[PDB]
């Protein structure tokens, strides 16, 4: 098989993944917007007096504390996977290094020149 068929299909294959990845990002933006509407609903502050506005303020204090408690735990979970990835990646590098490390190089040229 000609190089041009093989290269164009792996090229087209990567290009479709790029379109799908751009969609993943748009889908995440769409879902984040909807998640925000329901997770952090708007304040009905207009038309309220002192006691009513204080209740909104107290509710927000509880809500900001809760959003950081959950954010912190999620942040820790993201961090845990990053640490495991760095460790798994190094194990892979050493297993693979054993296959090519000791034998691959650009050598024995001066051997003929001399």
């Amino acid at each position: 098989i000609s190089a041009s068929r093989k290269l164009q299909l792996k090229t087209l294959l990567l290009q479709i993944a790029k379109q799908e990845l751009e969609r993943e990002a748009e889908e995440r933006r769409g879902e984040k917007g909807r998640a925000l509407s329901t997770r952090c609903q708007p304040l009905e502050l207009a038309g309220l007096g002192f006691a009513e506005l204080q209740d909104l303020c107290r509710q927000l204090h509880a809500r900001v504390d809760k959003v950081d408690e959950e954010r912190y735990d999620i942040e820790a979970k993201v961090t845990k996977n990053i640490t495991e990835i760095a460790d798994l990646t190094q194990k892979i590098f050493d297993l693979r290094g054993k296959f090519k490390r000791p034998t691959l190089r650009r050598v024995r040229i001066s051997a003929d020149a001399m």
Partner: protein, 62 residues
Amino acid sequence: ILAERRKVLAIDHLNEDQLREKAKELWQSIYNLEAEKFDLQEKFKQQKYEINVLRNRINDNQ
């Protein structure tokens, strides 16, 4: 850490105009923090994908 990170509003001694503005300040903070949670959750899932791929790569080269 959370006590240091959470924002706190003045409440009991504020009048209506002050309370509307203070309620607004945490609302936007919460909104932005919920946005971070969403993105962190998506990052977590993408990183979990990489984790299982890597666990298999170790066994595949061993």
